[PDB]
């Protein structure tokens, strides 16, 4: 059963972030589908609504919002989070003063992208925002953001990033998003400082 439920959410996940045009379902700009189309996919025969509730209320990063949609249609689902589809409406929270943004904006990544981060800065990659937590792996509140077997964490200073224009966004699973410059990228003028993780924590220069 935790395989299938294992299994249901990277389905759920890559269906709802990156497949869904090539699966030929219709997902609207805000990233919901509807649950009745998505079910009635091949890959997905095998699963209930109620294995889908399940897996909704239960995946610890909180990936998926279900809500009910208009009355012939039933339930809808999308990712909070993560699309390489183009959802320009997908509901987040702008986060526009300082105040909004948590203390800690931390970016988790490995020693094999570490030369071309600090040449380049964070890029978006294929993803339409670059992902950044409110802590480390383990800190409170840090459901999701930042994957637990990062080696290298850079900080970011959300408030200059702000002066400068980046805009950030808290997802409904609490990650922060930013679209980054015109380019894709929050160039390394905003990096506050970095840190090992991996092996042991020590801190790193810029
Ligand atoms: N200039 C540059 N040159 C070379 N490499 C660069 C670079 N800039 C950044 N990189 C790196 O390019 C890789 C892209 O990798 P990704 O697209 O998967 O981004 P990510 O790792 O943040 O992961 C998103 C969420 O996915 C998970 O959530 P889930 O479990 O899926 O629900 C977590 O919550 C995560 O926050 C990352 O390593 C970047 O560090
Ligand atoms: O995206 C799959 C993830 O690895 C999985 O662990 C879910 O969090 C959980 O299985 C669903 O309840
Ligand atoms: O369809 C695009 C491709 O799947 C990739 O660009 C995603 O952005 C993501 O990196 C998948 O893990």
Redesign the pocket.
């Known amino acids: 059963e935790q395989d299938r439920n294992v299994q249901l959410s990277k389905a759920l ?1 890559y269906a709802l972030r990156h497949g869904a045009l090539k699966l030929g379902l219709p997902m609207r700009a805000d990233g919901f589908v509807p649950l009745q189309a998505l079910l009635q996919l091949p890959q997905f025969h095998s699963f209930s609504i109620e294995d889908v509730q399940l897996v909704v209320n239960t995946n610890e ?1 909180q ?1 998926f919002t279900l809500q009910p949609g208009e009355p012939s249609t039933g339930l809808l689902i999308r990712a909070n989070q ?1 699309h390489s589809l183009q959802v320009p409406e997908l509901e987040l929270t702008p986060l526009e003063t300082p105040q909004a943004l948590p203390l800690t904006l931390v ?1 988790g ?2 020693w094999k ?1 570490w030369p ?2 600090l040449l ?4 978006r ?3 339409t925002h670059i ?1 950044l ?1 409110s802590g480390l792996p383990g800190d409170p509140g840090v459901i ?4 637990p077997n990062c080696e290298v964490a850079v900080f970011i200073d959300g408030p200059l990033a702000l002066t400068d224009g980046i805009p950030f966004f808290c997802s409904a699973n609490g ?1 922060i998003l930013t679209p980054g410059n015109a380019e894709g990228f929050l160039l390394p003028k905003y990096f506050k400082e970095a840190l090992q993780l991996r092996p042991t924590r020590k801190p790193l220069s810029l």
Not at 120 to 123: D, N, P, V
Not at 144 to 147: A, K, L, M, Q, V
């Open positions: 996940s990063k990936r993560g970016h990544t490995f992208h071309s981060i380049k800065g964070l890029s990659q294929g993803r992902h937590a999701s953001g930042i994957r990650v």
